[PDB]
Every structure is written in structure tokens, then in C-alpha cells.
From Swiss-Prot:
Lineage of the species this protein comes from: Eukaryota, Metazoa, Chordata, Craniata, Vertebrata
Subcellular localization(s) per the UniProt record: Secreted
Name used for this protein in its record: Albumin
Assembly and binders: Interacts with FCGRT; this interaction regulates ALB homeostasis. Interacts with TASOR. In plasma, occurs in a covalently-linked complex with chromophore-bound alpha-1-microglobulin; this interaction does not prevent fatty acid binding to ALB.
Covalent S-S links between cysteines: 50-59, 72-88, 87-98, 120-165, 164-173, 196-242, 241-249, 261-275, 274-285, 312-357, 356-365, 388-434, 433-444, 457-473, 472-483, 510-555, 554-563
Gene Ontology cellular-component terms listed: cytoplasm; extracellular space; protein-containing complex
Transmembrane segments: none
Record's keyword terms, sorted: Allergen, Calcium, Cleavage on pair of basic residues, Copper, Disulfide bond, Lipid-binding, Metal-binding, Methylation, Phosphoprotein, Repeat, Secreted, Signal, Zinc
Coiled coil: none
Xref: SMART domains: ALBUMIN (SM00103)
Organism: Equus caballus (Horse)
N6-methyllysine: modified positions: 530
InterPro entries in alphabetical order: ALB/AFP/VDB, Serum_albumin-like, Serum_albumin/AFP/Afamin, Serum_albumin_CS, Serum_albumin_N
GO BP: cellular response to calcium ion starvation; cellular response to starvation; negative regulation of mitochondrial depolarization
Length: 580
């Protein structure tokens, strides 16, 4: 009826305003905070005026016409987003499509730094404005963040400041919390970007297959009917969020959380905890829920999926069902596999049937089908064991450095900040996954690599530089990791010209936190590879150890700058000799 009334009634003023603030920040990432808050109140007012009189003018326009109209009222649009004004000429959905495409995955804004005194200050004098700002800062940095999940984090962030602002020593309560939360924002953001990237680049059918694999591992006791239903509904939730439809996305999400809690007995014993919780906790808890124990009545699969003579007839009849069922069954018994491994096994199952059923004796052919999955399984298992050995041997920083070398060799045309960001994210896959019980390491590692590879692809979408990267990013979602693992030193590379200043250090580096010192060195390392692509990881490890030693020394000196100045250029030249 009035779609905007309806959502307002369903969501209530607070959340309504929340999600409307996020939406606007993510669509207009540059606008001062004040204008968004203003645009938000205006829509909220119209919403209220509509809830009271659904028959009133323009109350029956769709949401996107309404928000699209509000965004296009914003002043200096053509100075702030010269590229956006254009979308404003268009109708809907054309208009929305246009804003979407214009979203910025790397607006490269200032780092959100916890200034606890000035933040506790700002919080006390106005809690609503302080939290609203938080949503804006985060939304505009992560224009595809899972809308409703941000309202959830903003609660945590509120609890953070509520506990630490009266607390004794302020920063030491608050700074480990805000760092922890930031880590969760970044992972959360990555998980969602992969979902939306999957919608954009591979379509729903791919998003559903992913979801079937995953939800079956999590809910191995639910039947297939029940899995299909949730996947159907969840896909619709994320489709909407990814399309910028946040109010509908949230409303649909609450519906699904309620469905799931009505049925937790047919779904999972692990939901109990989640279901006893308030709305936003509940959804978050369901979203992040752990895998239930395997039922003791899992069916052998030989019979229907390898022995049956009718398989061909069954498969031809309705492929997507028979295959979905296969995927449901294989995944439910394999929480020890990664989602992409499962999706790879499903394409091989499928590929094997396409093949065998075309042959004169399909049953003699498809009978060994499960034995084709073996190589699929051991390849990633050994790749994880290998990288976990290396990691436990050399620790995060060196593991990252090995990854930054590996990736700069694979894609030397990518900018150093990106190679560094990625190599660093990749290395944190080790820290996270390698310490886990052994059978969890494969799924952790690959599911996490998916997130980081997709981040590389996303950046690469805005700034394309390498064809090998394009190919891996666009070929097959399921083959993405194996496609990247397979790249080697790009042989067509032309060593970047040497530029002394790049590798020249100064005293300023001395008062950066460790975290930031590393990035400085790690950038130099990428630069070392670009200029000398053929040097082995071992030569680079040694040369960088020298650079590290030189920095420690000079920063420790009475005269830091004469140290850097006298020692640097010598180390700069001799180090090229070691990279021959
Ligand atoms: C309902 O059966 C399916 C449907 C689509 C799929 C897609 C993929 C990967 C993600 C792809 O690259 O398209 C894998 C397995 C699938 C099984
Ligand atoms: C368990 O820890 C890891 C961490 C990073 C990894 C990166 C890669 C990439 C895809 C590569 O190109 O080799 C593979 C495996 C990995 C396992």
C-alpha cells in the first residue's frame, strides 16, 4: 500500500532511521554527516505522515523513488559526485542501478582511530548523534556492509562506550574493545562483499548453491525441504541488501529469524541459545551459529547417487533438484570441507553425469563417480598443511612477507598498497585457521581465502591492471582459489625502473606503532619484488632482514637522521646486488 508506512510500522522509528542512515552513507560516501542526518529526518517525517494517512500524495511511490528522490535533492551533488548527477536524470530502477555502480569500494578515507577522551566527551553530550556518526563512518567505508548487522555492531559499540567512559583507566578498557570490533567489522564486511560480488558476477543460482552447501554443513539434521526454504529466503534477504533495499532486507531478515526459531527442533539444537535473545542478537547469533552434530542416521549415498540405474532419467528430468539434493547430502556430512571444495565436488558430480549418461552404458560409467572427488580433496588439504607448517615456523609477519612476495610475483602490476593489504589479509588466514583443531583448518582456510581473494577482485574491478587477475576473478567462483594458487611469476613483466627514494628511510618511521612500521617495510618489500621480480623468496627475506636491522639501529640512535642518512644509501645499493 504505502511501502514506506509499512516498513516504518514493521521496523519502528529507531531501526527505520538506522537503516535509512546506512543506505544514504553507502550511496553517498563523501557527504558531510550533517546532510545525511538531515536527509534522514526528512524521509522519516514523510514516513510518519504516510503511516497516519496512507492515502496522502506520494505515499504510494516505491521506496527507491522516494530515497532516490531524496538523494538527488542533496546540494553540490555535481561538485561532490559529478559522476552521480547523471543517475538523477534517470527513472527507477535505472536510477538505482546507476547509483549502485557508482559505489566506491576503496574510497580510501581516514582510518577510524579511537580518540577515547574526545569520544567519551562527544558520547556523553549526545549519545544518538555519536552512534549515528558511527553508522555513517562505517557504512560509507563499506558501501556493501550487511545493513542490519551494522545496527547490531553499533549496539556493541554503544555497550563499549557505556562500559568504558565511567571506567577507571579509560583507554585500556576501551582501546582493546574498539580494535576487536574493528576486526569484526572488517571480517563481517568481507563476508558480505563476497555475497554481493557473487550476486553481481555469477548470479543467484551460484549464490544459492553456495548457501545450500554452507547451510547443510551447519544444519546437518534439517531435512532438504527445510534447507531449501531457508536458503530461498536468505538469498532473497541478501539480494535485497546487495541491491540497496535495506528496509525490506531487514524486515525479511526478521521474518526469517522468526521462521527459524519456530522450527529449531527440525533445524538445529544449536539454535536454542540464539533463540532466547533479542531481535538483533538473535539474527546475528543465527547468522554466526556453529555447526550441529551429525545425525546418526545419515544415509549411505552410493545407492541413489552411484548405483541406481535411473540416475540419467532422474538427472535429465530435473537437474537442479537432483543436483541440489546431492549437494545437500554431501555437504551435510562434510563440515570438514570448505564450501568451495563442496561446490567443486558438485560440479564434478554433475560433469560426470553429463558425460556418462551420454555414453552407451551410463551405469558402468557413473559407478566410480565418488572416486573422482579424491584428488579434489587432497589438493587443498596439502596446500593448507604446507602453509600452516610455514606459518607456525616463521610467525605472522614473515608469513605475510612470503605472501606479499608470492602475490607481487603473480601480479606485479597491482599497486603496492593493495599487494600489501592483500598479503597481510592472506597471512591473517594463517593466524586464525592454523591454530584450530586439525579437521577445522581446511574449511576455515579456504572460506577465509575466498573473502580475501574477492577483496582483491573487487579492488581489481575498480582499477584493472592485470589480465591474469581478470581471468581468475571472472572464470568460476568455485575455481577462484585454485586459479590464483596456480599463477606464477608473470613472465611478461618488465621490471619496474629502480628509484632510490622508494627504498630510502628516515627517522619519522621511528614513532609509528609496530603495525604501521611493518606496512612501511612490507611496502618496500613489494617494491623490491617489482624492481627485481626474479629474486627468490630467500634472497628477499635476507635483504629485508637487513632493512629491518638498519631501521632498528637508526631509530635507536642519538642522532636518528644522520644514522639513516649515512647508512641508508650504502644498504640501498648493496641490497640490489643480493637480489640478482
Ligand atoms: C543446484 O546445483 C548447482 C548450481 C549452481 C552451481 C554453481 C557452482 C559454482 C559457484 C560456479 O562457478 O558457478 C557450483 C555448484 C553448483 C551447483
Ligand atoms: C592456512 O593458511 C593459508 C594462508 C594463506 C594462503 C594463501 C594461498 C594462496 C591462495 C596462494 O596463492 O597460494 C593458499 C593457501 C593459504 C593458506
Amino acid at each position: 500500500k504505502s511501502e514506506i508506512a509499512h516498513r516504518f510500522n514493521d521496523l519502528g522509528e529507531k531501526h527505520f532511521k538506522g537503516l535509512v542512515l546506512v543506505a544514504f552513507s553507502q550511496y553517498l560516501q563523501q557527504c558531510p554527516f550533517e546532510d545525511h542526518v538531515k536527509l534522514v529526518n526528512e524521509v522519516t517525517e514523510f514516513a510518519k505522515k504516510c503511516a497516519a494517512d496512507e492515502s496522502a500524495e506520494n505515499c504510494d511511490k516505491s521506496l527507491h523513488t522516494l530515497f532516490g528522490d531524496k538523494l538527488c535533492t542533496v546540494a553540490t551533488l555535481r561538485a561532490t559526485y559529478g559522476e552521480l548527477a547523471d543517475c538523477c536524470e534517470k527513472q527507477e530502477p535505472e536510477r538505482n542501478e546507476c547509483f549502485l555502480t557508482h559505489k566506491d569500494d576503496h574510497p580510501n578515507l581516514p582510518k577510524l582511530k579511537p580518540e577515547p577522551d574526545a569520544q567519551c566527551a562527544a558520547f556523553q553530550e549526545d549519545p544518538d548523534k555519536f552512534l549515528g556518526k558511527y553508522l555513517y563512518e562505517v557504512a560509507r567505508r563499506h558501501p556493501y556492509f550487511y545493513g542490519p548487522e551494522l545496527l547490531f555492531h553499533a549496539e556493541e559499540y554503544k555497550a563499549d562506550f557505556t562500559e568504558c567512559c565511567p571506567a577507571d583507566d579509560k583507554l585500556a578498557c576501551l582501546i582493546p574493545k574498539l580494535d576487536a570490533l574493528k576486526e569484526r567489522i572488517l571480517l563481517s564486511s568481507a563476508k558480505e562483499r563476497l555475497k554481493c560480488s557473487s550476486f553481481q558476477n555469477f548470479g543467484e543460482r551460484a549464490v544459492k548453491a553456495w548457501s545450500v552447501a554452507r547451510l547443510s554443513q551447519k544444519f546437518p539434521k534439517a531435512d532438504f525441504a527445510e534447507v531449501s526454504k531457508i536458503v530461498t529466503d536468505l538469498t532473497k534477504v541478501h539480494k535485497e541488501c546487495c541491491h540497496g533495499d535495506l528496509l525490506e532486507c531487514a524486515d525479511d531478515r526478521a521474518d526469517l529469524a522468526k521462521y527459524i526459531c519456530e522450527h529449531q527442533d527440525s533445524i538445529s539444537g544449536k539454535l536454542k541459545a540464539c533463540c532466547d535473545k533479542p531481535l538483533l542478537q538473535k539474527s546475528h547469533c543465527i547468522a554466526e551459529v556453529k555447526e550441529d552434530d551429525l545425525p546418526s542416521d545419515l544415509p549411505a549415498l552410493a545407492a541413489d547417487f552411484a548405483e541406481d540405474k535411473e540416475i540419467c532419467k532422474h538427472y535429465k528430468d530435473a537437474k537442479d533438484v537432483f543436483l541440489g539434493t546431492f549437494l545437500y547430502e554431501y555437504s551435510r556430512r562434510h563440515p570438514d570441507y570448505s564450501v568451495s571444495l563442496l561446490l567443486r565436488i558438485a560440479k564434478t558430480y554433475e560433469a560426470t553425469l553429463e558425460k556418462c549418461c551420454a555414453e552407451a552404458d551410463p551405469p558402468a560409467c557413473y559407478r566410480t563417480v565418488f572416486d573422482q572427488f579424491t584428488p579434489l580433496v587432497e589438493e587443498p588439504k596439502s596446500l593448507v598443511k604446507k602453509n600452516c607448517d610455514l606459518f607456525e615456523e616463521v610467525g605472522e609477519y614473515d608469513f605475510q612477507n612470503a605472501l606479499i612476495v608470492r602475490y607481487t610475483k603473480k601480479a606485479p602490476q597491482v599497486s603496492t598498497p593493495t599487494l600489501v593489504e592483500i598479503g597481510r589479509t592472506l597471512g591473517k588466514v594463517g593466524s586464525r585457521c592454523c591454530k584450530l583443531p586439525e579437521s577445522e583448518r581446511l574449511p576455515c582456510s579456504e572460506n577465509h581465502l575466498a573473502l580475501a581473494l574477492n577483496r582483491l577482485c573487487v579492488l581489481h574491478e575498480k582499477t584493472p591492471v592485470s589480465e591474469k587477475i581478470t581471468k581468475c576473478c571472472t572464470d568460476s567462483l568455485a575455481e577462484r582459489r585454485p586459479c590464483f594458487s596456480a599463477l606464477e611469476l608473470d613472465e611478461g613483466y618488465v621490471p619496474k625502473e629502480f628509484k632510490a627514494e622508494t627504498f630510502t628511510f628516515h627517522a619519522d618511521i621511528c614513532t609509528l606503532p609496530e603495525d604501521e612500521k611493518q606496512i612501511k617495510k612490507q611496502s618496500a618489500l613489494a617494491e623490491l619484488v617489482k624492481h627485481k621480480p626474479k629474486a627468490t623468496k630467500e634472497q628477499l627475506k635476507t635483504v629485508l632482514g637487513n632493512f629491518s636491522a638498519f631501521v632498528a639501529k637508526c631509530c635507536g640512535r642519538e642522532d636518528k637522521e644522520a644514522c639513516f642518512a649515512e647508512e641508508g644509501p650504502k644498504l640501498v645499493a648493496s641490497s640490489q646486488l643480493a637480489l640478482a
